[PDB]
Design a protein around this ligand. Structure first.
Ligand SMILES: Cc1cc2nc3c(=O)[nH]c(=O)nc-3n(C[C@H](O)[C@H](O)[C@H](O)COP(=O)(O)OP(=O)(O)OC[C@H]3O[C@@H](n4cnc5c(N)ncnc54)[C@H](O)[C@@H]3O)c2cc1C
Ligand SMILES: *[C@@H]1O[C@H](CO)[C@@H](O[C@@H]2O[C@H](CO)[C@@H](O)[C@H](O)[C@H]2NC(C)=O)[C@H](O)[C@H]1NC(C)=O
Ligand SMILES: *[C@@H]1O[C@H](CO)[C@@H](O)[C@H](O)[C@H]1NC(C)=O
Ligand SMILES: *[C@@H]1O[C@H](CO)[C@@H](O)[C@H](O)[C@H]1NC(C)=O
Ligand SMILES: *[C@@H]1O[C@H](CO)[C@@H](O)[C@H](O)[C@H]1NC(C)=O
Ligand SMILES: *[C@@H]1O[C@H](CO)[C@@H](O)[C@H](O)[C@H]1NC(C)=O
Ligand SMILES: *[C@@H]1O[C@H](CO)[C@@H](O)[C@H](O)[C@H]1NC(C)=O
Ligand SMILES: *[C@@H]1O[C@H](CO)[C@@H](O)[C@H](O)[C@H]1NC(C)=O
Ligand SMILES: *[C@@H]1O[C@H](CO)[C@@H](O)[C@H](O)[C@H]1NC(C)=O
Ligand SMILES: CC1(C)OCc2cc(C=O)ccc2O1
Length: 518
């Protein structure tokens, strides 16, 4: 593991080429425009800037404006904070009724997330059928890991949960490993051992400062196309005062959408790329009919129990993973709170913890259930789109939640967890629970799964490879337009996908530079 980061301050050196979108001198022609300074978009823009003039457009501001985004201790704060339209956490509620959040900040969701770092399941590449350069994938993981990933230090709760997973039969013991494999392991973290958050914005430090420009509070409202050989030629973006701006690509350059599972389909639909009948019904002029834009949108379920130990436990960031094919498990330990972190629990109606608690969680893989992103406003990109995930519409997802919940049952029965019981009785009713405890034939587990579901926050889809994009991430039917972010794949690459999407930004950047090379 030569290729890991050190403890270090968050590196804001890149702010020397970050400008307010109010600056009209950013307007003009570039080789590349990247829309969304997020998980994929930052390493993509940094990579393209090695050879070419790049403009990165981000709707949010810089992370220095919200200091609680820069520490492990700050994780809860950013979710607890009210969404005033400027904050790094944007709140939404799916049409299923499940509270959720997305990032609105330079560095994207890597600035607000739970820090867990893993490489994709090595079977994922062949499952996609894309002709990946697998050696280049691994070099690109090392380039990310060298910059922002550490081997975490021991945390007492994470060690308890790892011992519990192993005693519950989540085998083998993989020790410390970044790989998504069956068994129990310590994985990597983008929080360093001093609790400093590292993130995708720091990969902008790898860019060429003579070639890369970043516009913040740049809300990209439309992709501009050639008038006739249909090509993307540029974007309209507005600034924080509401004034409009244009930027263009030139020659053999390209526009890449990296606006996330929610923002990419939304901007494609606003730009007339999407289902012909849907867009016609909104009187949006169709530039490229595609029945799949904003279709196949997925949210992996989170199901959980909360235990209240009779003695305090130390708060922790998640580093210890229990992985099976059919469920991915972790646990966080938290301080109590009287303001809830929005979307931790699926509604605002959830009881508040009075003392320290362990949130013990299982994630459904895939998932197979899907829904869609549709426009709320046919013109205004600042109005969030409608999103529906149809949680547990697919019975296989429900079957996998039942298996995961039975395994959390096994975990609550381990010697590892016994000291955290309020009563030394034989049964798991010896724990004190915040909210609904586990119910042991299948009907009661099914009800528990359905009624107590939350977002894992690892939503993906809406612009899938094989539906909207080709195997090179190009929008089918349009020259000079790509999509690179979590909108691109219908199944998770692993339990914790930020690692894959950080890698993907640079990887596709290297594919574009190779395609263009002589
Ligand atoms: C609370 C939370 C915790 C998570 N924890 C983890 C975890 O610990 N580990 C893990 O592996 N994964 C985790 N995830 C998931 C993972 O972080 C995300 O799936 C991944 O970061 C998504 O990357 P992306 O590039 O698709 O989107 P983002 O990183 O969200 O990037 C999209 C960017 O585009 C910008 N944007 C959107 N629309 C526009 C527009 N029109 N114009 C301009 N800019 C625009 C956004 O502001 C944003 O910065 C978590 C997610 C959340 C929400
Ligand atoms: C890693 O990804 C693979 C491929 O998607 C997962 O799928 C397994 O592989 C076989 C064929 O490759 C399939 O029949 C099953 O869906 C999976 N196998 C089993 C035994 O269930 C695999 O499960 C993923 N691994 C983990 C640990 O998540
Ligand atoms: C250790 O973390 C502290 C917490 O704020 C911070 O002051 C410092 O940057 C870290 N140490 C370093 C960078 O060596
Ligand atoms: C951009 O400029 C405006 C003033 O025109 C200001 O209100 C806003 O905060 C600035 N944004 C950033 C990110 O500096
Ligand atoms: C890439 O790295 C993984 C571990 O993450 C290893 O299993 C795999 O063999 C590597 N593949 C190649 C092509 O080197
Ligand atoms: C526009 O479309 C025509 C098809 O009539 C195509 O041949 C041409 O390459 C395009 N030209 C420009 C300037 O966009
Ligand atoms: C679309 O425009 C036509 C006028 O051409 C109008 O009849 C129809 O109601 C419009 N629909 C919407 C949804 O704006
Ligand atoms: C927009 O969202 C609101 C409130 O979030 C929703 O209830 C309304 O029906 C939506 N409108 C459209 C046209 O989708
Ligand atoms: C669940 O998902 C699969 C797609 O993998 C589909 O074939 C299957 O028919 C779906 N089942 C239900 C109950 O819809
Ligand atoms: C596994 C998961 C979702 O990770 C993050 C997390 C954070 C808190 C902080 O209050 C609490 C619980 C929690 O659980």
């Amino acid at each position: 593991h030569h290729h890991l980061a050190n403890t270090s301050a968050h590196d804001f050196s890149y702010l020397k080429f970050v400008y307010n979108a109010t600056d009209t001198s950013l307007e003009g022609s570039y080789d590349y425009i990247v829309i969304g300074g997020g998980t994929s978009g930052c390493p993509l823009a940094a990579t393209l800037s090695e050879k070419y003039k790049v403009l990165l457009l981000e709707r949010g501001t810089i992370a220095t404006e919200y200091p609680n985004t820069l520490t492990a201790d700050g994780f809860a704060y950013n979710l607890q904070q009210q969404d005033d339209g400027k904050t790094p956490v944007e709140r939404f509620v799916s049409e299923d009724g499940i509270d959720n959040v997305r990032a609105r900040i330079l560095g994207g969701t890597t600035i607000i997330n739970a820090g867990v770092y893993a490489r994709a399941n090595i079977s994922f590449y062949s499952q996609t059928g894309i002709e990946w350069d697998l050696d280049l994938v691994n070099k690109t993981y090392e380039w990310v890991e060298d910059a922002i990933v550490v081997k975490p230090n021991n945390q007492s709760w994470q060690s308890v949960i790892g011992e519990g997973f192993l005693e519950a039969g989540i085998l083998p013991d993989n020790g410390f490993s970044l790989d998504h494999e069956a068994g129990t392991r310590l994985t990597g973290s983008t929080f360093d051992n001093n609790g400093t958050r590292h993130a995708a914005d720091e990969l902008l430090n790898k860019g060429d400062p003579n070639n890369l420009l970043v516009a913040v509070q740049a809300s990209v409202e439309k992709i501009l196309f050639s008038s006739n050989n249909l090509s993307a030629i540029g974007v309209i973006y507005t600034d924080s005062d509401g004034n409009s701006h244009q930027a263009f690509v030139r020659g053999n350059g390209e526009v890449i959408v990296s606006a996330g599972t929610i923002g990419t389909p939304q901007l494609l639909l606003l730009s007339g790329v999407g289902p012909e009948s849907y867009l016609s019904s909104l009187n949006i002029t169709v530039v490229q009919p595609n029945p799949y834009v904003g279709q196949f949108v997925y949210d992996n379920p989170r199901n959980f129990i909360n235990i209240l130990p009779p003695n305090p436990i130390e708060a922790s960031v998640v580093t210890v993973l229990g992985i099976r094919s059919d469920y991915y498990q972790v646990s966080a330990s938290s301080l109590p709170f009287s303001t809830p972190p929005f979307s931790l629990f699926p509604t605002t109606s959830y009881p508040l913890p009075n003392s320290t608690f362990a949130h013990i969680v299982s994630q459904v893989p895939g998932p197979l259930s899907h829904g869609s992103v549709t426009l709320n406003s046919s013109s205004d990109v600042r109005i969030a789109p409608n999103i529906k995930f149809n949680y547990y519409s697919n019975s296989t997802d429900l079957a996998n939640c039942v298996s995961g919940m039975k395994k959390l049952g096994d975990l609550l029965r381990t010697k590892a967890l016994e000291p955290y019981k309020a009563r030394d009785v034989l049964g798991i009713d010896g724990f004190n629970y915040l909210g609904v405890p586990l119910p042991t034939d299948d009907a009661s587990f099914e009800t528990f799964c359905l009624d107590n579901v939350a977002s894992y926050w690892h939503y993906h889809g809406g612009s899938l490879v094989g539906k909207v994009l080709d195997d090179s991430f190009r929008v089918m039917g349009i020259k000079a337009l790509r999509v690179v972010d979590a909108s691109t794949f219908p199944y998770e690459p692993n339990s914790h996908p930020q690692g894959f999407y950080l890698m993907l930004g640079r990887y596709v950047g290297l594919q574009i530079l190779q395609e263009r090379s002589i």
